[PDB]
Short mmCIF file of C-alpha atoms and ligand atoms in Angstrom, two decimals:
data_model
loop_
_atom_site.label_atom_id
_atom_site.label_comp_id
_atom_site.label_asym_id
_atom_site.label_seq_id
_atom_site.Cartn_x
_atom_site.Cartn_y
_atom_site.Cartn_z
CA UNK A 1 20.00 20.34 12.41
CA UNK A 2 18.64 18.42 9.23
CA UNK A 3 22.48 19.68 7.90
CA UNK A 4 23.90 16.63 10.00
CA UNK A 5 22.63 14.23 7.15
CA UNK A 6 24.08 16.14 4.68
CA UNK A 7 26.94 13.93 3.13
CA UNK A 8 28.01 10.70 1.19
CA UNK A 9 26.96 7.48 3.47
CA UNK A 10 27.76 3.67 2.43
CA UNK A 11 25.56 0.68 3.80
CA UNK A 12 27.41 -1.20 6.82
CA UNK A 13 25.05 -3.30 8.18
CA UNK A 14 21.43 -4.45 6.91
CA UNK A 15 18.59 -6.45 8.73
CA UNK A 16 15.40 -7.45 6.97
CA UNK A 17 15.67 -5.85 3.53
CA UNK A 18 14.97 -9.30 1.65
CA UNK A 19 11.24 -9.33 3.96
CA UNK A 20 10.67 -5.70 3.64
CA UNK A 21 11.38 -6.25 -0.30
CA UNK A 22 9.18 -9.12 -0.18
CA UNK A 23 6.69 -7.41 1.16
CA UNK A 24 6.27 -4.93 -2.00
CA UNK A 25 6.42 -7.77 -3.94
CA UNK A 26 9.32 -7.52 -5.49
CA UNK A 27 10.47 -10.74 -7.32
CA UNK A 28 13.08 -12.92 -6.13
CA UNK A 29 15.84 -12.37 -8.70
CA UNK A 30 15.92 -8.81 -8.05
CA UNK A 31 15.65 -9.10 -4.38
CA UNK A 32 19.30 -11.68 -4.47
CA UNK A 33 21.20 -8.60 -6.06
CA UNK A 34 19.87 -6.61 -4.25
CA UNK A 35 20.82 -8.62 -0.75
CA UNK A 36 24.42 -8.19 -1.91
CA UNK A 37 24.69 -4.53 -2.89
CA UNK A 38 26.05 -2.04 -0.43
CA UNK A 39 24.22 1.42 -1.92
CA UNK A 40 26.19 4.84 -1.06
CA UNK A 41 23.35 7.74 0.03
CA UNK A 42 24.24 10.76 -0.57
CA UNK A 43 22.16 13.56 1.04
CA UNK A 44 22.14 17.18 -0.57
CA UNK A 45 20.68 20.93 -0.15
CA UNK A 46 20.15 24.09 -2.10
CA UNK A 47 18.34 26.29 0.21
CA UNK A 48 15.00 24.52 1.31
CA UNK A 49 15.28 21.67 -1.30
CA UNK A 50 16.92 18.57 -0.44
CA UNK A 51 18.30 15.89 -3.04
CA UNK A 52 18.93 12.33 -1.95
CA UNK A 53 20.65 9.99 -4.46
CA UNK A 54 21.17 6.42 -4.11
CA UNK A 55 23.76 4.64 -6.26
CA UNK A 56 25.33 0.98 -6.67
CA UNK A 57 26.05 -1.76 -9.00
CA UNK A 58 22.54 -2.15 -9.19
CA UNK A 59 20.42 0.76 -9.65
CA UNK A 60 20.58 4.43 -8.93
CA UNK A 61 17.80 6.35 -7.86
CA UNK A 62 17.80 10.27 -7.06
CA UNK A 63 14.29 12.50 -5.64
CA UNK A 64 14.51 16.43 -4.74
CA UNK A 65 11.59 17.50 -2.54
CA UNK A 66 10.95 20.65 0.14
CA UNK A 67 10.50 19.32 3.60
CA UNK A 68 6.77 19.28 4.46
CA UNK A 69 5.57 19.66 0.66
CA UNK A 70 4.44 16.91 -0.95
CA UNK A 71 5.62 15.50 -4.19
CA UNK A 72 4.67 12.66 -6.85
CA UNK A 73 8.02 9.94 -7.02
CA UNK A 74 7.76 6.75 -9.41
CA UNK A 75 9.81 4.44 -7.24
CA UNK A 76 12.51 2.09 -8.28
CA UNK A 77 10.01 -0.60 -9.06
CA UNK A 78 7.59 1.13 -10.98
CA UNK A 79 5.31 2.41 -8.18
CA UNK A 80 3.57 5.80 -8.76
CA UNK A 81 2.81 7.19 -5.38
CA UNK A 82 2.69 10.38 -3.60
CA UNK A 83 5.16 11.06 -0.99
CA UNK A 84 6.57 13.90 1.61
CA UNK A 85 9.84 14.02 4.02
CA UNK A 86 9.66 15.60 7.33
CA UNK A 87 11.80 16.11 9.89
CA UNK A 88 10.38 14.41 13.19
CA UNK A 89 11.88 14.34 16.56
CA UNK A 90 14.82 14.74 14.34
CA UNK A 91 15.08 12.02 12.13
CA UNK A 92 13.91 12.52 8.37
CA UNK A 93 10.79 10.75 7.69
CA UNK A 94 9.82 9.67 4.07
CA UNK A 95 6.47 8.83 3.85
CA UNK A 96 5.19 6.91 0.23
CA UNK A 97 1.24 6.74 -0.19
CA UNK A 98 -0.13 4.37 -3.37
CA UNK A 99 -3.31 2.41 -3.32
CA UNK A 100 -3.85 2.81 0.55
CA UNK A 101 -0.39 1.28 0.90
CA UNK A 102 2.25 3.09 2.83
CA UNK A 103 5.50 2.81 3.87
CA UNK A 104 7.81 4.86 5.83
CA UNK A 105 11.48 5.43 5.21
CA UNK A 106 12.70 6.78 8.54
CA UNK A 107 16.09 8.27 8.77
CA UNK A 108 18.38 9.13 12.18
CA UNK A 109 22.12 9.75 13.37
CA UNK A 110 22.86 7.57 16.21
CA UNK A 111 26.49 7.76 17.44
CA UNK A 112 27.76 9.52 14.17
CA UNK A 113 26.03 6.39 11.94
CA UNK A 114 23.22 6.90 9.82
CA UNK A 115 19.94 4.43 10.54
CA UNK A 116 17.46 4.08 8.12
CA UNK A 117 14.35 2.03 8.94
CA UNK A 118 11.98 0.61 6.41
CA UNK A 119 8.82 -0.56 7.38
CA UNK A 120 5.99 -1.54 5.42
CA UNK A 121 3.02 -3.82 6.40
CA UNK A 122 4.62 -5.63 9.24
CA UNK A 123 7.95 -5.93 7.58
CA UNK A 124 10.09 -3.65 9.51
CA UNK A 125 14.42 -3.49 7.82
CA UNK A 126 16.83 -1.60 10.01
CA UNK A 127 19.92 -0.26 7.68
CA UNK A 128 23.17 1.33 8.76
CA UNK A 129 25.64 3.93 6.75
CA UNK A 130 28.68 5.15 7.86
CA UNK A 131 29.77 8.32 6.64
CA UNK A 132 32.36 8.75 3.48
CA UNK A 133 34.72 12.05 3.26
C1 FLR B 1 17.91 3.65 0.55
C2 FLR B 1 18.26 2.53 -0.28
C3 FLR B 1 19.09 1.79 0.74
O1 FLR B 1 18.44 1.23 1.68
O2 FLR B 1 20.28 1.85 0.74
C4 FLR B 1 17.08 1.84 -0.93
C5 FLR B 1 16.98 1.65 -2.31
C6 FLR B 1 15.86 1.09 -2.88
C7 FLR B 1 14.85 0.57 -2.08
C8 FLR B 1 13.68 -0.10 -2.68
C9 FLR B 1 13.04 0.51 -3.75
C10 FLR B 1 11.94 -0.09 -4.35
C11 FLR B 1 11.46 -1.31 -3.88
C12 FLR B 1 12.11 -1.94 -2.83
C13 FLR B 1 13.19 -1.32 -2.21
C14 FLR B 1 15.04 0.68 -0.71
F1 FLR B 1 14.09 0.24 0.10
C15 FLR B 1 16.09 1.38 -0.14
C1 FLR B 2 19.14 -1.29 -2.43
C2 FLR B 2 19.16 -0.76 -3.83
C3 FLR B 2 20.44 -1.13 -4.54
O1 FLR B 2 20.91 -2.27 -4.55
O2 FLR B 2 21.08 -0.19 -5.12
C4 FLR B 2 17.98 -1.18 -4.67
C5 FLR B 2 17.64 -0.45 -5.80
C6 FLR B 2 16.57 -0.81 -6.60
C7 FLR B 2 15.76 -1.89 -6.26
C8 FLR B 2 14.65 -2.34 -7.13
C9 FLR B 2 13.54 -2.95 -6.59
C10 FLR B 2 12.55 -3.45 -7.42
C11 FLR B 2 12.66 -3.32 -8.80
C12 FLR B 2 13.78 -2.75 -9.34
C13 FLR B 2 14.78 -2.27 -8.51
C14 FLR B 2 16.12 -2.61 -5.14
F1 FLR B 2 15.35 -3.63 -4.78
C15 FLR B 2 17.18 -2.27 -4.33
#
């Protein structure tokens, strides 16, 4: 069930971020703090609404949405785009749309571990959470 997300999960393990970040342009100041931070998710529900916060010594960030509705989000860096989240062969997909761009945000539980996978362009970042109590 999507309820196996549900929790508090801190980064363990990272591989790409700095080229997927690159790859939205973000500058290179931003992209060193952010190649040291180790962001807790924490993945919530009410019913059929999900919340998903991300917090660290950098920046917090926080979206509620339905699963298969979409919704407007202005991203961390300023991006207005239109988004949806799915569930997908089991993993939670987040889709972000903006000037023809996309990117994909693709969530899964593998061995008790959350993996997220960021790809946008051909920059492709696999991150791993562990679960908190
Ligand atoms: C989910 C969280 C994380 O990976 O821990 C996170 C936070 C912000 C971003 C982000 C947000 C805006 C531009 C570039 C990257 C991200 F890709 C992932
Ligand atoms: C991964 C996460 C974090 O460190 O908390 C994060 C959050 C925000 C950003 C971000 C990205 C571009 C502009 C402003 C902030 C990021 F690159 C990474």
């Amino acid at each position: 069930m999507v309820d196996a997300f549900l929790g508090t999960w801190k980064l363990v393990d990272s591989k790409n971020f700095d080229d997927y970040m690159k790859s939205l342009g973000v500058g290179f100041a931003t992209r060193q703090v952010a190649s040291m931070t180790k962001p807790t998710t924490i993945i919530e529900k009410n019913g059929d609404i999900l919340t998903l916060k991300t917090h660290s010594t950098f920046k917090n960030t926080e979206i509620s949405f339905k699963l298969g509705v979409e919704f407007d989000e202005t991203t961390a860096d300023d991006r207005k785009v239109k988004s949806i989240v799915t569930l997908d062969g089991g993993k939670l997909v987040h889709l972000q749309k903006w000037d023809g761009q996309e990117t994909t945000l693709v969530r899964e539980l593998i061995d008790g571990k959350l993996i997220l996978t960021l790809t946008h362009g051909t920059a492709v970042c696999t991150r791993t959470y562990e679960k908190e109590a």
